[PDB]
Design a protein around this ligand. Structure first.
Ligand code: SF4
Length: 83
């Protein structure tokens, strides 16, 4: 069950970025974002994931203020976690 503040499929920015809380149900292959092969990309290894926000599998994303993403998710702004 998603948290009350989870990013939802109906969120305009989620639609624009093609977010899904399950990266296996994402278009990461089509997007081919750089830094890792697409099959390896999900929120947990993204620079925008905020490890100190949320709990468990539901963590912050800088791009979605006030909400939570799933660590196993993906969107088209995926960027390698470099620091
Ligand atoms: S920017 Fe990164 S952490 Fe945020 S939803 Fe997209 S892939 Fe997940």
């Amino acid at each position: 069950a998603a948290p009350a503040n989870a990013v939802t499929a109906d969120d305009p920015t989620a639609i624009a970025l093609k977010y899904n809380q399950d990266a296996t149900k994402s278009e990461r292959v089509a997007a081919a974002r750089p830094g890792l092969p697409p099959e390896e990309q999900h929120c947990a290894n993204c620079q925008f994931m905020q490890a100190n926000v949320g709990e468990g599998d539901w963590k912050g994303c800088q791009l979605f203020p006030g909400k939570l993403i799933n660590v196993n998710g993906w969107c088209a702004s995926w960027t390698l976690k470099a620091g």
